[PDB]
Each structure stands twice: as C-alpha cells, then as structure tokens.
Design an enzyme around this catalytic site. Structure first.
Site, mmCIF file in Angstrom:
data_model
loop_
_atom_site.group_PDB
_atom_site.id
_atom_site.type_symbol
_atom_site.label_atom_id
_atom_site.label_comp_id
_atom_site.label_asym_id
_atom_site.label_seq_id
_atom_site.Cartn_x
_atom_site.Cartn_y
_atom_site.Cartn_z
ATOM 1 N N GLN C 11 6.524 1.321 13.268
ATOM 2 C CA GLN C 11 8.124 1.281 13.212
ATOM 3 C C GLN C 11 8.874 2.696 12.850
ATOM 4 O O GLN C 11 9.538 3.097 13.542
ATOM 5 C CB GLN C 11 8.237 0.289 12.426
ATOM 6 N N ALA C 12 8.217 2.882 11.590
ATOM 7 C CA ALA C 12 8.962 4.447 11.031
ATOM 8 C C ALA C 12 8.439 5.565 12.036
ATOM 9 O O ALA C 12 9.285 6.140 12.581
ATOM 10 C CB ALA C 12 8.153 4.692 9.942
ATOM 11 N N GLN C 15 10.755 5.213 15.400
ATOM 12 C CA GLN C 15 12.100 5.523 15.329
ATOM 13 C C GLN C 15 12.445 6.770 14.927
ATOM 14 O O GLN C 15 13.384 7.611 15.463
ATOM 15 C CB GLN C 15 12.667 4.474 14.176
ATOM 16 N N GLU C 67 3.636 -4.093 18.227
ATOM 17 C CA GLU C 67 4.709 -4.957 18.480
ATOM 18 C C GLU C 67 6.093 -4.741 19.320
ATOM 19 O O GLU C 67 6.588 -3.995 18.560
ATOM 20 C CB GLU C 67 5.180 -5.811 16.928
ATOM 21 N N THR C 141 0.254 -0.698 11.149
ATOM 22 C CA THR C 141 0.086 -0.236 12.428
ATOM 23 C C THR C 141 0.061 1.261 12.102
ATOM 24 O O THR C 141 -1.019 1.908 12.237
ATOM 25 C CB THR C 141 1.486 -0.440 13.211
ATOM 26 N N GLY C 142 0.766 2.053 11.476
ATOM 27 C CA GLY C 142 1.059 3.461 11.136
ATOM 28 C C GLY C 142 -0.212 3.846 10.223
ATOM 29 O O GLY C 142 -0.464 4.966 10.401
ATOM 30 N N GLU C 179 1.882 -2.001 -0.243
ATOM 31 C CA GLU C 179 2.182 -0.619 0.377
ATOM 32 C C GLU C 179 1.118 0.337 -0.128
ATOM 33 O O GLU C 179 0.732 1.084 0.482
ATOM 34 C CB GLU C 179 3.313 -0.062 -0.048
ATOM 35 N N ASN C 224 16.271 8.697 9.263
ATOM 36 C CA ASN C 224 15.484 9.030 10.569
ATOM 37 C C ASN C 224 16.522 10.291 11.132
ATOM 38 O O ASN C 224 15.617 11.297 11.227
ATOM 39 C CB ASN C 224 15.478 8.064 11.577
ATOM 40 N N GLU C 250 0.524 30.416 12.519
ATOM 41 C CA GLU C 250 0.455 31.749 11.913
ATOM 42 C C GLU C 250 0.263 31.597 10.246
ATOM 43 O O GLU C 250 -0.515 31.989 9.775
ATOM 44 C CB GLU C 250 1.431 32.689 12.452
HETATM 45 N N1 LIG Z 1 12.242 6.707 6.914
HETATM 46 C C1 LIG Z 1 11.904 5.508 7.629
HETATM 47 N N2 LIG Z 1 11.133 4.502 7.023
HETATM 48 C C2 LIG Z 1 10.513 3.633 7.626
HETATM 49 C C3 LIG Z 1 11.091 3.023 8.787
HETATM 50 N N3 LIG Z 1 10.683 2.093 9.227
HETATM 51 C C4 LIG Z 1 9.609 1.729 8.330
HETATM 52 N N4 LIG Z 1 9.586 2.450 7.282
HETATM 53 C C5 LIG Z 1 8.670 2.525 6.159
HETATM 54 O O1 LIG Z 1 7.619 1.836 6.542
HETATM 55 C C6 LIG Z 1 7.197 0.941 5.601
HETATM 56 C C7 LIG Z 1 6.728 -0.402 6.340
HETATM 57 O O2 LIG Z 1 5.833 -0.008 7.518
HETATM 58 P P1 LIG Z 1 6.626 -0.050 8.972
HETATM 59 O O3 LIG Z 1 6.443 1.379 9.619
HETATM 60 O O4 LIG Z 1 8.001 -0.755 8.936
HETATM 61 O O5 LIG Z 1 5.473 -1.286 9.563
HETATM 62 P P2 LIG Z 1 4.851 -0.923 11.100
HETATM 63 O O6 LIG Z 1 4.425 0.429 11.185
HETATM 64 O O7 LIG Z 1 5.836 -1.237 12.241
HETATM 65 O O8 LIG Z 1 3.422 -1.725 11.046
HETATM 66 P P3 LIG Z 1 3.924 -3.207 11.209
HETATM 67 O O9 LIG Z 1 5.077 -3.774 10.443
HETATM 68 O O10 LIG Z 1 2.534 -4.054 10.957
HETATM 69 O O11 LIG Z 1 4.060 -3.599 12.878
HETATM 70 C C8 LIG Z 1 8.299 0.661 4.568
HETATM 71 O O12 LIG Z 1 7.823 1.155 3.356
HETATM 72 C C9 LIG Z 1 9.590 1.629 5.157
HETATM 73 O O13 LIG Z 1 9.893 2.551 3.954
HETATM 74 C C10 LIG Z 1 12.342 4.067 9.361
HETATM 75 O O14 LIG Z 1 12.840 3.550 10.505
HETATM 76 N N5 LIG Z 1 12.447 5.112 8.737
HETATM 77 MG MG LIG Z 2 5.410 -2.450 14.252
#
Ligand SMILES: Nc1nc2c(ncn2[C@@H]2O[C@H](COP(=O)(O)OP(=O)(O)OP(=O)(O)O)[C@@H](O)[C@H]2O)c(=O)[nH]1
Ligand SMILES: [Mg+2]
Ligand SMILES: Nc1nc2c(ncn2[C@@H]2O[C@H](COP(=O)(O)OP(=O)(O)O)[C@@H](O)[C@H]2O)c(=O)[nH]1
Ligand SMILES: [Mg+2]
EC number: 3.6.5.-
Lengths: 431, 113, 436
Positions: C11-12, C15, C67, C141-142, C179, C224, C250
């Site tokens: 997600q993060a 976006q 997702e 995911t990430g 987390e 973002n 560099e």
């Molecule tokens: N800066 C920023 N942080 C985000 C964003 N979305 C999620 N996060 C951070 O990511 C953490 C949660 O993980 P996500 O990235 O939302 O989850 P995901 O990567 O989609 O993995 P799943 O939820 O299992 O599908 C939270 O602690 C948020 O602080 C975003 O759009 N911008």
């Molecule tokens: Mg996701």
C-alpha cells in the site's frame, strides 16, 4: 631513438592530455584538421617524436585515448582539435569506473586492455625505432589509475627494451571528488615505483594553491588547473621536441636525472606563473626567471625544496636570451644554496636552451627536479591512507571487487619504505 | 664501499623477504584441498579442530537425561562442498564453531561450548 | 543509457510511488497521457523513462500489491494511459499485516511473473545500473514480498545495485500491533542484499506536516507528497546532468563505510506552507543551516550526540558553488559536528540546476533553491533501538508469534533475526571507537 607512443587514461588524464596536444600542436604549427602551416623549420626538425606522418600533408598525434566513461570521448571529438585523431586510436568502454581503482585494474578495465594493446601494437609496428611510452592519468580516479597501472604493467612487459614515462596527478583534499583518493593513489604509487622509469608528479593540491593564491582565482575550475598542467608538460618535453644535445631522448634524460632505481619522482617548476589569457605588462628577465622557477611558489608538487636537497636538475629556458647570462645565473642559484644540493653528483644541474618560446610568453623557465623533498607528498598520502586503513574502512568496495587485504599492506609498506629511502639519501655526506 | 646505502640495503633485502612471506601463502594457499567460498573459514577450522583437547571431563544432578547426536555429512553436502562446523572431543562436550564476521569483514570464530 | 528501474510494493510503496512519478512527470514535463513536447522520440531522464513508438514516454516501474484495491486506482486515475498495463501486477488476498505470508505462502506463486515482467523491462535497456525498491517496513506485503523479491533479484541480477526506500512505521497511523516483528524480519533478511537503505520515519513526516504545513491530522496524501519531494531531491542528481552534479552512484560510494552500515539519515531544507503566505526566499546559508535541525530531519533521532561518517548535499535550483562553499564554512567549525577519527571531514555537493517543482494545490510552498542532505550518522541506531524495545516485550512472551509460525516460518528465525539486530547495534557502536 625516435618515436614516442603516447597514452591518456581516465577523466583527468584524457582532459589534460587533450590540452597538452593542443599546446604542442600550436607550438609546432598544426591545425585542427592536421595540415602544417608554420613559419619555421626548427619546428619540424623533430616533429615525428609525437606525430604519425599521414598522407595528404597531414599530421596525426601518435596517441591513444582510453577511458571507460562514454562521454569523455564525446567531449574530445566535438572539442576543438577532436577532428585530427585517427579514429581507430579511440578505445573506450561503457561501464565507467566510479573512482574505483580495483574496478579499473582487475574487472571492467581488464575487459578492454587487450584491445588497447592491439592499437598500441598497430602504432608500434609502423614505428621504426621506438623510444618509449608517455602516459598521463589521474591517481585519485578509477579509470586512469587502475587501468593505467594495468597498461603500464602489460606494456613494459611486452617491450622491456623501451622507456616508460608517466605524468600522474595527485589527490587533493582541497579538490576531492571522493574520499577513497588515498587508496587509489597508494596502490597506483605501489605500481609506479617498480614499473616506470620517469614519473612527473603533478600535485592537485599544489595547483589549487597556485590558482587560489598566486593567481588569485577564488573558485578554481578544473580547466584552470589544466592550464598549469599543460604549460608544465609543454616545458618539460622541450628537450625531446626540439634539436638539443642535452636530454635528446627519454633514455638519455632518464640516465641523467635518475641515480637510484626507485627514486624517479620529479618536482616540476614553471615560471612565470601565468593565468589564462593574461597580458605580460613587463615580461620577466633572466635573473627573475631563474629566481622564480626554483622558488617554492612555482612548484607543481605541494612541497618545499627549502626542506629537501636536489639530486639532479634539468633546467630549460625557452625564448631567445643571453646564454652567458643563463650560465652565470644558474651558477648563482647553484652555489648560493649549495647546502641544498648534493655535492656527490658533480655537474648534476644540466641546462638546455630553446628558441621558440611557449605560446604568448616571450620567455619562460621550465624546471625538472629529482628532489628528496617529494617525500612531503608521499607522507601526506601515507598518512591520509593510514588513518582510514587502521579500522579497514571502505575496504569492501575493493575486496568486494576481488582483491587481497595484503595487497594494501604491501603498498603502504612499500611507500613508507620509499620515504625512508628518500630521507636516507638526503642525509648523505662526502666521507 | 659507503654507509648510507647500507641502511638502504638493510631495507632492500627485507622487502624481498616480505615478498616471499607473501609468495609463500599463494602457492601454499593452493595444494590439494584448497577451495570453496568458505576456504578462509575452513582454514580457520582446520587450524582449530586439532591442536587442542588437553582438558577432559564431574557434572551435576539433573531432572532429565539430555543427550545430543551428531550425524556425519552426506553426498549432497560434500559434492557441493559444505563444511563441518561441529566437533565433539569428549563424551560430554558439544562444540560449535559459529562462523561470525565483525563489522569490518574480519572473519572470526564464536566458539560456543 | 545508464538506466534504472523502480519497484513499488505494498500500500505505502504503491501510493508513494504514485506521488513520486507524479512529481517526476511534473518536473521533467510530461502530461498524464505520457507525451512530452520537447523530446525527440538518450538524455538524463531516459534512465527513468523509456520512449515507445509514438513518443508515449512510459516509466520503468513495476507496481505490486497483493490486494488489487490500491493499484486499481492507477487504472482509474489520470495516469491509467501513462502505464504499460502489463507492469501493474496485482494479487487477490492481502498479506494481512503478516510478513510470512509475503515471504513464503502468498509471494511464491506470483514472484515468477513479477520477474518475467521485470525481465521484460530489463531487456529494454542497454546498460542498467540498479533497481529502486519502494516499500514499507510495516505491512505484510511490503516486508515479506520485498525480502523475497530482493532474495531473487540478487540471483538474477548479482552485478546490479539495489537501493531501498523504507517506511518506518508511526504508531499514529499504524494499522497493526505486530509492526515491530515485520520490520525486524525484513531488515534481517534484506540486509545482506541491499546496498543503501533510505529510511523514512512516518512519525517524522507527521511532525513535519504538524509544524511547517500546520495540518492537524494530515492524510496519507500529504505524507506521500512530502516524501515524494524528498525522493525527487535525491534522484534529481540521477535524472539531470549539469557539469555540477555527479551520479548518486558516484557518492553512494562515500556514504557507506561498512557493508552493514548503509542507512543515511536524510534532511530536507525549506518546508513552508503555501497557505501561510508572505515569505522571503532563503539564502544558501539559511537552508544549509536548516539541514542540521532535527526538525527538518527524516528519521526521529538526534545526530548532535552522535558521530558522522560522511555528508552529502544535493542542492537544486539557484545555487552558485561559492554560495555552497561559504555556507559550508559557516557550518564547519561553528557547530558541534563531529567525525570519526578514521574519516576525512569532507563534503561533496551535487549542484542540480532545475528548481523544485511542487504540486498544484500541493501545500508545499514552491521555492527557488533547496537542499537535501544525506548524513550517515551513528545516531540513526536510535530508530533501531526504538524497534527492538517494542519487540523485546512481545517476543519476551512470544505473543503474536503463532501467526508467523502458522504460515510457514520457524521460531528460531526470530531469535536469529533479533540477535542479528543487536549485532547491528553493537556495530554502530564499534564505529565510534578511536585508536591510539
Ligand atoms: N507514508 C505512508 N505510509 C503508509 C501508507 N500506507 C501504509 N503506510 C504504512 O504502512 C504500514 C502498514 O502497512 P501497509 O503498507 O498499509 O500494508 P500493505 O503493504 O498493503 O500490506 P497488506 O496490508 O497486508 O496488504 C503502516 O504502519 C503505515 O504507517 C502510505 O500511503 N503512506
Ligand atoms: Mg496491500
Ligand atoms: N587537474 C585536474 N584534475 C582532475 C580533473 N578531474 C578530476 N581531477 C582529479 O583526479 C581525480 C579524479 O579522477 P578521474 O579522472 O575524474 O576519475 P577516472 O575517470 O576514474 O579516471 C580527483 O582526485 C580529482 O581531484 C581535471 O579536469 N583536472
Ligand atoms: Mg571517468
């Protein structure tokens, strides 16, 4: 003894090489297309030393341009004299270097060196009696230092009956492209000690000094330094480029200027200290020339000769002037500071005169010096280096490219040893 | 027939000696079993392994008979030359040779007993 | 060229990836359809973008989320035409804030097309430098699919570089309790592969948009956009080419003194409300002063009680070399800035001459000259110890472990990853010792 095959490697080495070819091409009287238009025969008495003779009344620099950057050669071709270079003598890769010696000397560089050697051999087969090889590079970068030292090794091993000549430039904390310049420099010196017969040490820091202080250029750009380099190189090669009994070829000059196998590190000296495109409201005399070109303010290495004793000196005066005045003034400088010269080498200060002066300058004074003061350079590096080598910092950027940790200690040790050698021969007496 | 040189000779002779103390490793860092990315780690273990084991075992009262078995390497771990990092010198001591690396890439051995 | 390839996971990462390529199109001048007015269908920006046939300039990015709700916004948004559709790869069931579902169960079945498609991008290039990976330290995911994805990219592309853009989780917008576990895991597995990991404290971004933009509850959007601006400062030295800017590769060399010490705290200079108007432009000296205030910092830490190992300043806009040198003089000794005894206290500066283009209605007040400093300081270890505490209570009672083990992983992987973390902290210590 005749032809000199020239090479330039790296970003710095290719830049300053370009400028040097501009200089001597303008002195001898060669145009960006290659035709000869001069108004003196003395210019073409010894023109083959640095020039292939091509059909159509042309002149091609017997040179070979080497890099692993792409864009440097682009800056060459579209440069002014970029038309004259025989295009087959361009050889360059696509990876880069990253100011990484190990990359230049073992990996991305080693996948181009044989192709360099084939062009070198193509220029050496069309030779008659090859003298040696002149090389210019940076010691703080990755391309020229690493791939350069590689080329020196393989060429001095392919023809060990010829001369190996290098114009190396130093790392400067006052310029500083990176922070592994001490490492690059250290290894490159470790090679240069056993590999080359002559090494004209240009110190980047010293040039930053001469630009910012003597010339008062407050933000020294790279070309600013490259002017001082170009002048220095034009001067020291005067002996080779014009009729002269003294220092006629590389072997002679080396035998006169090198009394010990390792110690072949020369402090050059230029006078007067000239900016780019500046007037000479009162061109120097002969006493003023001789006085400046031994003064520390005119030195290309960031060292004081008031601290080190010369082993040999090759002084070159350019421009017509009184030869008696020259001999007298040289005697003056010698025996007024005889406590700064070695006496166990008699008549060690040779002097040759030229008639066509440098571009624009009415008279100049070019000085080569085998000084035991040059250690003030090494001891800088060998400190800069040690400070980082103690906790083995930044080592993964070379060992990760496939080297051995002992290859560094062989280098630091060999350098500290060269300095102990220099001091040893400094404390010499007549017993 | 001078001095000063003499202090330089004393140098020149030692530099060659240093060279042989490097040209020794190389052709002697070859010979028979002398490879696989763990070559340094293996040479470490080998310079360990033997040259040891003077002291032997006087234990305590337990609530459980705890015992450990070591199996030998097989064809898979040998063909792709893996390394043996467990030794047992006495019927009472399990030694592990945890191959660690400092921050600065200096390989050392954490010798859990 | 000397191409790059961006990757955006979770997600993060997706976006923030959209904000990043948004800003890229704005600064380099491309409209959402992928067309550029100035180009001829081999320039500094042709490393991040590829030219098609009809001049339809298209990114070199692969987007992945398990997702598809977060990537569908791409195919509905203004840039649905911008992308080659085959590199908007999506799954079905989100990893559900579970690392192990990323690294093992869910990711295994999709990695192979992820890399056949990344392959489809790599065959477009003539000399690829490395991959830019954008993901969060938190969500399943990430963390998981990036740990595995890198474990694979190191197989298929060993010679290439790998730069992380990492999102430390903030408790305020944290969408999970576990987390710390995910973070520790993906750091452990990703460390030996990744070459340089830029870390982003979401807490810090929140505080920035609390002070200088005066937003009371900033949306994910605001964050973002800000993070995107900083990333544009970092990559700008890759995407432009004056005679006064050097490659990020560099001076990547100078930022990482040890293989495991590759986390440069970033710092970004002018951050002012476009609403709160009436503003005098700042001199080079003033922004170079601001590059050392923990306010304008990226991770929540305190470099004043910590030693430095390098320093980079990427200026963009109106900057003369002499202005930089003078500001560097005012900063050098006048402050308590300390280097380790094994490192030259030198600065390298990348002067990029393109100004910082902000966002239409983007509450970033547009400015003429900005600077982004990359300082590799030992105080960054703070951000790790803030993790290992929130961890070492939960893992003290093994609470929540049963999920991660319940999707494939063993327990000993936890004690190992944690032990390795403590090792890293003691390494950020061993950096500080001297000699005599
Ligand atoms: N800066 C920023 N942080 C985000 C964003 N979305 C999620 N996060 C951070 O990511 C953490 C949660 O993980 P996500 O990235 O939302 O989850 P995901 O990567 O989609 O993995 P799943 O939820 O299992 O599908 C939270 O602690 C948020 O602080 C975003 O759009 N911008
Ligand atoms: Mg996701
Ligand atoms: N005199 C001079 N020195 C330079 C120039 N460019 C770089 N240097 C110096 O040379 C070193 C960099 O080497 P460089 O040739 O750029 O790296 P390479 O391409 O890998 O060979 C640094 O220590 C610089 O101080 C230049 O144009 N002129
Ligand atoms: Mg280069």
């Amino acid at each position: 003894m005749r032809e000199i095959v020239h090479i330039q490697a790296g970003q710095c080495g290719n830049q300053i090489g370009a400028k040097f070819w501009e200089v001597i091409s303008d002195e001898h009287g060669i145009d960006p297309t290659g035709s000869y238009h001069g108004d003196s025969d003395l210019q073409l008495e010894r023109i083959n030393v640095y020039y292939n003779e091509a059909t159509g009344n042309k002149y091609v620099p017997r040179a070979i341009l080497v890099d692993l950057e792409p864009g440097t050669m682009d800056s060459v071709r579209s440069g002014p004299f970029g038309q004259i270079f025989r295009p087959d003598n361009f050889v360059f890769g696509q990876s880069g270097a990253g100011n990484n010696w190990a990359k230049g000397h073992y990996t991305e560089g080693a996948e181009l060196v044989d192709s360099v050697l084939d062009v070198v051999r193509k220029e050496s087969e069309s030779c008659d009696c090859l003298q040696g090889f002149q090389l210019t590079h940076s010691l703080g970068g990755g391309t020229g230092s690493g791939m350069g030292t590689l080329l020196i090794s393989k060429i001095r091993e392919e023809y060990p009956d010829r001369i190996m000549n290098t114009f190396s430039v130093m790392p400067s904390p006052k310029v500083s492209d990176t922070v592994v310049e001490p490492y690059n420099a250290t290894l490159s010196v470790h090679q240069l000690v056993e590999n080359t017969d002559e090494t004209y040490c240009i110190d980047n820091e010293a040039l930053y000094d001469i630009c910012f202080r003597t010339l008062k250029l407050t933000t020294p750009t790279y070309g600013d330094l490259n002017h001082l380099v170009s002048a220095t190189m034009s001067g020291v090669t005067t002996c080779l480029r014009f009729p002269g009994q003294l220092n006629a070829d590389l072997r002679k000059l080396a035998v006169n200027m090198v009394p010990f196998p390792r110690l072949h590190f020369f402090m050059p000296g230029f006078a007067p200290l000239t900016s780019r495109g500046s007037q000479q409201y009162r061109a120097l005399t002969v006493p003023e020339l001789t006085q400046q070109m031994f003064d520390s303010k005119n030195m290309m290495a960031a060292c004081d000769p008031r601290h080190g004793r010369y082993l040999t000196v090759a002084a070159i005066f350019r421009g017509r002037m009184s030869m008696k005045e020259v001999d007298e003034q040289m005697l003056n400088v010698q025996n007024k500071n005889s406590s700064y010269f070695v006496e166990w080498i008699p008549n060690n200060v040779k002097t040759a005169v030229c008639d066509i002066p440098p571009r624009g300058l009415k008279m100049s004074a070019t000085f080569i010096g085998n000084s035991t003061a040059i250690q003030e350079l090494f001891k800088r590096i060998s400190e800069q280096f040690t400070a980082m080598f103690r906790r083995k910092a930044f080592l993964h950027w070379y060992t990760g490219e496939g080297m051995d940790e002992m290859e560094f200690t062989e280098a630091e040790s060999n350098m500290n040893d060269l300095v102990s050698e220099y001091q040893q021969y400094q404390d010499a007496t007549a017993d | 027939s001078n001095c000063v040189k003499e202090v330089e000779k004393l140098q020149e002779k030692r530099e060659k000696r240093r060279l042989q103390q490097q040209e020794l490793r190389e052709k002697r860092a070859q010979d028979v079993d002398a490879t696989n990315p763990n070559y340094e780690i293996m040479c470490m273990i080998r310079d360990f392994r033997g040259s040891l084991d003077y002291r032997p075992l006087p234990i305590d009262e337990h609530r459980i008979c705890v015992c450990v078995r070591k199996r030998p390497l097989n064809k898979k771990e040998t063909q792709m030359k893996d390394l043996d990092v467990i030794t047992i010198p006495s019927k009472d001591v399990v030694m592990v040779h945890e191959p660690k690396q400092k921050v600065d890439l200096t390989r050392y051995l954490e010798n859990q007993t | 060229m000397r191409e790059c390839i961006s990757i955006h996971v979770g997600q993060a990462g997706v976006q923030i990836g959209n904000a990043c390529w948004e800003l890229y199109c704005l600064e380099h001048g491309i409209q959402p359809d992928g067309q550029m007015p100035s180009d001829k269908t081999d320039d500094s920006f042709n490393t991040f973008f590829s030219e098609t046939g009809a001049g339809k300039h298209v990114p070199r990015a692969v987007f992945v989320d398990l997702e598809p709700t977060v990537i569908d916004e791409v195919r509905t948004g203004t840039y649905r035409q911008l992308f080659h559709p085959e590199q908007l790869i999506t799954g079905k069931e989100d990893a559900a804030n579970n690392y192990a579902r990323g690294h093992y169960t869910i990711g295994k079945e999709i990695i192979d097309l992820v890399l056949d498609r990344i392959r489809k991008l790599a065959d477009q290039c003539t000399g690829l430098q490395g991959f830019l990976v954008f993901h969060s330290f938190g969500g399943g995911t990430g963390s998981g699919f990036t740990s595995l994805l890198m474990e694979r990219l190191s197989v298929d592309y060993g010679k290439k570089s790998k730069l992380e853009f990492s999102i430390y989780p903030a408790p305020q917008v944290s969408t999970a309790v576990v987390e710390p576990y995910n973070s520790i895991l993906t750091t452990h597995t990703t460390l030996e592969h990744s070459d340089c990991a830029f870390m982003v404290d979401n807490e810090a971004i929140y505080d920035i948009c609390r002070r200088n933009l005066d937003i009371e509850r900033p949306t994910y959007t605001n964050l973002n956009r800000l993070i995107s601006q900083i990333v544009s400062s970092i990559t700008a030295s890759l995407r432009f080419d004056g005679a006064l800017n050097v490659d990020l590769t560099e001076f990547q060399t100078n930022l990482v003194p040890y293989p495991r010490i590759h986390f440069p705290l970033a710092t970004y200079a002018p951050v002012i409300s476009a609403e709160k108007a009436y503003h005098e432009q700042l001199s080079v000296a003033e922004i170079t002063n601001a590059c050392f205030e923990p306010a304008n910092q990226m991770v929540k830490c305190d470099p004043r009680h910590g030693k430095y190992m390098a320093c980079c300043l990427l200026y963009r806009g109106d900057v003369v070399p002499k202005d930089v040198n003078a500001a560097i003089a005012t900063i050098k000794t006048k402050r308590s800035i300390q280097f380790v005894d094994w490192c030259p206290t030198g600065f390298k500066v990348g002067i990029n001459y393109q100004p910082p283009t902000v966002v239409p209605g983007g509450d970033l007040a547009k400015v003429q000259r900005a600077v982004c400093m990359l300082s590799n300081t030992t105080a960054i270890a703070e951000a790790w110890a803030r993790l290992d505490h929130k961890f070492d209570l939960m893992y003290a009672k093994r609470a929540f472990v049963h999920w991660y083990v319940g999707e494939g992983m063993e327990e000993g992987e936890f004690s190992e990853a944690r032990e390795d973390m403590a090792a890293l902290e003691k390494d950020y210590e061993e950096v500080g010792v001297d000699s005599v």
